[PDB]
Structure formats: C-alpha cells, structure tokens
C-alpha cells in the first residue's frame, strides 16, 4: 500500500489548492450522514477489526484505518485536504491489500471511498455549485450530448492534441455501454455488487425534466455511471478502460469548456448565475 499515492492523482481534489472552513466539523457532519444513508456499506468500515482476532491482518497492514480514527484527527493545517483524502483512501487501499480483489467488502470499501469523495467533491466546489436554471440547463444538455456522441478519436485530440495516437476509432461512441443499466435478472451479480446504479439515459432524462437542482447534482450522477463501472468489472477489462476515458473526457468539458463559457457569458450579460444556498452549510450549525 502506497498512502501517499492518491487513487487518481489528476483529480481536483489533489490538483486544487482548496479547504473547507472548520473542516473537522464538516468532516464529522458529512461521514455521520453518509454511515446513516448508507448503514450496510458503511458498517464494516467504522471501526478497526479486533487485534484480538486478526494478527496477520495487522502484519499485512502498515497503516491501519477506520472511519471513527478519521474523524478522532485533526486536518485544519495546510496539508490537512491531502492527508485526509488520503486517510479517507486507506479504507479501500487496505482493504485491497489484505482481501481478494473480487470480494463484497473490497467492492464496498471502494463506494465508500467513492461517496466521501463526491460529498468532498460538492463542498468544495461551492464557489460554482450554480442552481440548474434555463440557460444552465441548456448548456448541460450540450455537453452531455457531446460526451454521448464522443469517440476515441475526438475524445484523444482533445486530451493530447498533436500528441494523440494516429489509428483512433472515428465511428463507436464509448458511451454506448453506458446507456442502459444490465437486465436484473441477466445479471442479478450486479445489483447484488453495485449499490446505486446509474446510466447516462437516466442522467440525461433526469436533466430534461429538471431532477438536479444544481450543477453537481448533475455532475455526480455523471461520475457515479463511470465509476460504478471501476467497481463492477477488473481492471483489465476493455469497459474499464472506455469508463476511465470518459470520466477524464468529462472532467475536460466542464472545467476546460463549460465552466469557462458560464464565465464568459455572466461576464458578457448573457447569463444569470444564481444559487439555491440551502444547506450549503449545515455542518457549521
């Protein structure tokens, strides 16, 4: 286990240099709501496993991790984001280390650490975390549309430019096994392993119809069908690679393009960029 490699070192959460106001307060606050949302993920990763009954769980482990040692910690000093992130990856990384890569609780120890994350995610992006009004809405809608209709070969000329390989499919949308969620009753292991299924023709009909209130609403249903798919199939597999694709093209399009157009059209009088404060922060009470 290598603690201070961050499970996707190109996430803004390592790459920006943010913090949460009283984020030992936020930290309690937001783990108590997800162990409670989520009781059956969460319970194996409260506290640590019994010295008494596991030695070589303690021989394989050099830094045991429990969700009730993150929130004994303080984190308000500067590499206080960091440290915690990567406390918070622990919890898979361990878990990893010492179970078979195939089992139930390594494939919950990875939505744990998946759904502290998109929380974090949220919290820290409340600066832009813009109410989905009309013209939001319709900006959302392209670039939704643009990832559906996104091949390999587009989607590399905007990640490497002149650097991008020369063969690249110009024809197969990587979004296709994405759509639709699986037949329950084809593969009933699925549901059993992934505890909430997402697929871009739900996001896509949730945005329509006006489902997410605001910006990251839209943007962790979009996060949760690519990495739902990290969870469900190995490392090695063709699917697991086109969901890695995706969420790095998607992560492209809304900090290169579409924050950037919001900016430059609120800047221009061409758009209302307006929020729906509401339990932005609660944590503080």
Known sequence: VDYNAPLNPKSELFLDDWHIPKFNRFISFTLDVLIDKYKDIFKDFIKLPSRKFHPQYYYKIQQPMSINEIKSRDYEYEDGPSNFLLDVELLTKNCQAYNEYDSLIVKNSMQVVMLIEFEVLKAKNLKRNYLINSEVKAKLLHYLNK???????????????????????????????????????????????????????????????????????????????????????????????????????????????????????????????????????????
Do not use: C, W
């Open 147 to 285: 990832l559906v209709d996104a091949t390999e070969k587009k989607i590399n000329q905007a990640l490497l430019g002149a650097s991008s390989p020369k063969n690249l499919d110009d024809k197969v949308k990587l979004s296709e096994p994405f759509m639709e969620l699986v037949d329950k009753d084809e593969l009933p292991e699925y549901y059993e392993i992934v505890h909430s299924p997402m697929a871009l023709s739900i996001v896509k009909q949730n945005l329509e119809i006006g489902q997410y209130s605001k910006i990251y609403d839209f943007i962790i249903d979009m996060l949760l069908v690519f990495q739902n798919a990290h969870i469900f199939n190995d490392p090695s597999a063709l699917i697991y690679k086109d969901a890695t694709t995706l969420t790095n093209y998607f992560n492209y399009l809304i900090q290169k393009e579409f924050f950037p157009e919001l900016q430059d059209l609120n800047e221009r009088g061409e758009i209302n960029l307006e929020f729906d404060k509401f339990e932005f922060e609660n944590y503080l009470a």
